Subunit: 341 residues, 4 copies
């Protein structure tokens, strides 16, 4: 019980000397050794976040969407295929460890998915290791993301098993109760930091999944070493996300729930809650704001590229009081900001 | 420097997931309350007049745990309640005893009623009165299993072990209705207290119980992974139909009264308060949720048994920001979860 | 530079010790100064909305002591002290400021039988205060003098040298106090009381834990830190004895409670307290009973028959903000009034 | 990789020192640069809802200075500073950005006899600012230049070799600032001011504590950290002398206050780093300065400091926790009467 772990709100990045203006920087990243994204953002594989429409709009902005799997195998293959024939867009698919597994994989592969994500509550498990070894045995050159994990031991075991990228985050998500009902989890920033570090010794990239709420948070995840950030609530309020529209006190809300929530899984022991976030309009506007945030951050840090950002970033722990100084304070805000609230 | 040691409670820490060859539906929650008593699930209902009586203790045993009948009633009525449990078909049953002038007559009567365990529980278990009590009771009934409490230190485990106790209950002040820490200034945060006492207890070969301050199934997992043999809850069980006292309807919702035994109402200078808690229906639904959460955590930690969970658990400390990450956050929740208030 | 963290009461808990002593067994006698013993280590504040003759008569007869405030003329505070000393031989205190009329106020309250003088100012670690003590003891060598307020052991050392018989600790912890906010200056009270009690004891000088106390458990902590007695304002300001009529607001009664450095009490001012209302507490006896029982209960937990043994054998532990939440009642709709809680 | 905690005002307290001095005896004089002395170490911020000529005149007349903002055309800002120099030779500053017309704005305010310019930017530790400083001093070698904003000792050194006469510390503390939220970058202000003050005093360049101040006690902390002066927007933006009329909202008077990097101030392609809201009306600046000044004198008396230099040299800080914070503020009281220096 000696060691303290930090999440995003716990730290700040120290500005560096910069010869670089924000609209000079390049957010290109390697999602895997083979898959290059233009911007390091991906939409979560949840039934209230990503289907083909969201996945098409992520691809076009430079990112990628991971079509969720809470649908028939044939419907997912249709969603993926819908993305592929909308141009030449990259598309991912979610796969669980099931008796369905390889039929789901065969359908999205033939439908030309670019990357599958074997994601489960506990990526550091015998099922996932065997599942990655099974998939890569059948499809060697296909790209496999394995998650979710929180330790460097977990990185190696999935790298050994053949994953091309690992996905970090047990407990941080906005709709997640894993840490509350199971007691298990690692604060996300320290999780990404430790996993990024072992991932770089091995040649395997890591994704920061969950818990990001502002663009500043993504800068921290990338500075920690993640190759890409994945978000649910940040995208689930967008027009392209599936989700009934609910009305309350003059505002429109989009339904957003955990995949491990009662309503998603339908004696259940859930690991998620169901709720709603405010409608935010079109993805493109949300992406602009996030990219602009990341660019300014790299400007403050003098980083022309994501690699230089990771190599030159210096972190500083702020207290509860610093956290209050960091947010707007002692202001009665009256005009909406596309950046904040 | 007098103020050196920081002590932690459940909400300060998190468990790090291990490599798991095992699924939640395969782990065994069997535990030894004492050496002669083995429960199937490591949960006990608290010895309170708004929590455990014959109706509660019967249902606890039927789910695999134990209820300790409270002592706020005549010696006649207590023996009667223990007997109903004993005549309900071979169900384990406890009874609490205070440091009283009538003490050995209370032990007498519930022993006659074939009680399986007694709890000599006082505000301060590491005291002369409890020390002599345990030896006095071991002098008359050496076969009898006696739990003693409450305590907060490793020194207290020794002196209670050298006095005869077969188990020791940890918890000074963490209780949801408890004001001991505020009115007396005394106590140890529960996770550190369990941890320190579990470590002395294991070396000496005596189990410890985590009593008080548990609220979610994940907290229990932390207590068991800290080394407790079982967990005692008052608040988590007091809203159920089997707890004593009737339901109140206040503004469309159902509530039951829940009070500290040290509160003015139970005693008719108090160390607890009286209040109302939400009605939660039948015990079996609460037990099912708690059991499920515990097996989830043990799956995460790769633990087939409770002792293996303790051997291999690593804790990490989270800040206030980790805490807010760990709970659902930045979401308007619209559907109640059965495991997340 | 910044590095040493300083703690207040809600940052820490006392670890229970083995106890051969039941709460009704433990003794609460304490030495306020070398010449003044109290049966209980409680003092009421030198504030116009806390302590007058009625407060200080009531305080004495329960075994503590009241310190009559200075926010009144010299004649009337001497009479106030004479009110107390005539009512069956009780101890009385009196507040004295660093002023031009300061010896005349001392002279009056002395003729008026005052047992203890408190030369309390915003900054006791100061030339005026130190000179003031030296001048008073030179005129009255037997008169017991408390000086404050301070927060450092260097301040204990210097006020002991100046002739003080007891020093009062507390810069900023007060519930009505804005000193830390407007001047940026202070020390969390628990660490202040420890550091100063450490120095006062080596010199043989008692120290008072003054301000920031809200519950009985808080008092126990101050005493285990080595304070000789605890001074409270807010806890006593709600009582019948305290000065001030009882204003009532939406079917509930209250009493005015204000800082002595608030605009109200001092009437170009730059205040260092606020002014407000706190709920009516009842009679002082019942409030004191509940505080005594917490102390006695805390000493039971720590197995200390006396305040000295409690100081020597106390083990503090730091609690985080989640420990704090677990320490208070949680997740319960409290429906009945506990006599000793909120 | 992540070992250093950095602190802000609400995290620390100053420990009282033995004192031979009373608050009224204490001296508030500070060198804003080697060539500029203020009688009180307070500055109003160069924002379009804090400082124009009227507030620059009101600050100067109290012993401080105002920086007229640059969210206006060049001739208007030169006219604005000329209005202050006309009111009895008062001190005046003007804000200058890294623009295509940077040297032309500098020309107009120099013509109107501005005492100091502030080359203030999101990121003062940048090639732009570093080159603007060299180019401004090369043409106007006696002009006093403040450069900012910054947060590190490397930034202090590099801007001093650029020619800055004084630097301005503060990445993200402002009450209306979202830089640390949107960009993830910044340093808690007290640690920032301390680290930068230390390097400035080794090099001979003073530093300004800019942003995140809320109470007079906070100013004392920032001066004891070693800053030569404190810059405020929120504290002064409710005052009658700040720009914009007094607004009513549910029977209480308010004024508008917004970040310069907020949408309204920068007026879809924008990515703002500030917000816009409203703050309570607090009256005329004279009454706010009074309460501020008295708080600083009280703090310095507690510290036995007759000068700001003596305060920096003998100030001791302790960290307080959130419980310490809770004790530090008033607590467990229903405040009935409004205190002119608290809420
Ligand atoms: C993301 C997430 N939660 O973060 C989640 C998503 C859907 C469902 C669940 C539910 C509520 C069903 N909860 C678990 O699935 N909980 C859990 C707890 C412990 C372990 Cl060890 C495992 C594992 N399951 C596997 C399987 F192979 F089956 F996929 C390998 S390990 C699973 C959780
Ligand atoms: C209790 C308390 N505040 O806690 C208080 C009570 C009444 C008035 C004040 C006022 C509002 C007047 N505030 C100061 O008096 N502030 C202050 C600040 C710094 C110093 Cl150094 C001094 C000093 N006073 C003396 C005296 F001679 F008066 F004793 C020597 S030095 C005083 C404060
Ligand atoms: C669990 C608990 N509170 O957590 C509690 C439960 C019921 C009643 C009380 C009351 C309000 C009556 N409070 C004390 O009992 N307070 C107290 C304080 C200090 C000591 Cl040292 C002792 C002790 N009593 C004994 C006994 F005589 F019982 F054996 C041994 S030690 C007791 C407390
Ligand atoms: C104070 C402040 N925010 O705290 C602020 C004030 C006005 C406008 C902005 C906006 C919203 C436009 N935000 C940035 O300007 N952000 C930013 C982020 C990172 C860098 Cl590296 C730079 C730079 N700009 C330059 C310049 F072209 F001005 F010379 C050189 S470096 C700028 C911010
Ligand atoms: O029910 C759940 N329980 C726990 N985690 C979930 C659940 N559903 C989705 N997640 C994870 O939470 C992430 C979204 O987090 P968010 O962006 O913070 O809202 C997803 O990428 C998943 O990794
Ligand atoms: O009045 C009281 N004061 C302090 N502790 C109590 C009181 N009554 C019961 N307890 C303890 O608190 C536990 C209940 O805590 P809970 O599970 O957090 O609600 C019981 O098991 C007892 O160990
Ligand atoms: O106006 C004030 N400013 C600062 N401290 C004050 C003021 N008035 C009283 N005090 C101190 O605060 C103490 C009362 O604190 P309380 O019991 O927490 O309310 C008094 O004994 C004084 O030491
Ligand atoms: O939009 C903005 N983003 C970030 N900082 C700003 C912005 N506008 C003003 N500032 C800074 O914030 C300071 C005011 O902070 P305040 O005194 O806490 O209200 C000003 O001196 C500027 O340095
Ligand atoms: K801010
Ligand atoms: K205070």
């Amino acid at each position: 019980i000696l060691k303290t772990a930090y999440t995003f709100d716990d730290v700040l990045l120290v500005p560096n000397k910069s010869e670089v203006l924000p609209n000079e920087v390049s957010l290109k990243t390697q999602l895997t050794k083979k898959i290059q994204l233009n911007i390091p953002l991906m939409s979560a594989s949840m039934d209230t976040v990503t289907e083909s429409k969201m996945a098409i709009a992520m691809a076009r902005e430079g990112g990628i969407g991971i079509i969720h799997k809470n649908m028939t195998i044939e419907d997912q293959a249709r969603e993926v295929d819908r993305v592929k024939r909308s141009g030449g867009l990259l598309c991912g698919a979610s796969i669980g460890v099931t008796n369905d597994m390889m039929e789901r994989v065969d359908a999205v592969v033939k439908a030309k998915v670019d990357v599958i994500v074997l994601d489960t509550a506990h990526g550091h498990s015998k099922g996932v290791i065997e599942g990655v070894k099974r998939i890569k045995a059948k499809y060697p050159e296909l790209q496999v993301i394995a998650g979710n994990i929180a330790t460097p031991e977990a990185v190696r075991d999935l790298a050994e098993a053949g994953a091309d990228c690992v996905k970090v985050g047990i407990g941080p998500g906005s709709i997640c109760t894993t840490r509350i009902v199971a007691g298990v989890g690692v604060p996300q920033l320290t999780a990404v930091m430790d996993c990024a570090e072992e991932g770089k010794k091995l040649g395997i990239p890591v994704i920061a999944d969950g818990g990001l709420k502002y663009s500043g948070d993504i800068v921290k995840a990338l500075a920690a070493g993640a190759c890409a950030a994945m978000m649910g609530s940040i995208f689930a309020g967008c027009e392209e996300a599936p989700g009934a529209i609910e009305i309350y006190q003059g505002r429109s809300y989009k339904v957003y729930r955990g995949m491990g929530s009662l309503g998603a899984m339908a004696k259940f022991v859930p690991e998620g809650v169901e709720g709603r976030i405010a409608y935010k309009g079109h993805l493109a506007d949300t992406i602009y704001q996030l990219i602009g945030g990341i660019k300014s951050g790299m400007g403050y840090l003098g980083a022309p590229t994501l690699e230089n950002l990771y190599e030159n970033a210096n972190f500083v722990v702020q207290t509860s009081a610093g956290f209050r100084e960091s947010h707007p304070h002692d202001i009665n805000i009256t005009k909406e900001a596309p950046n904040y609230s």
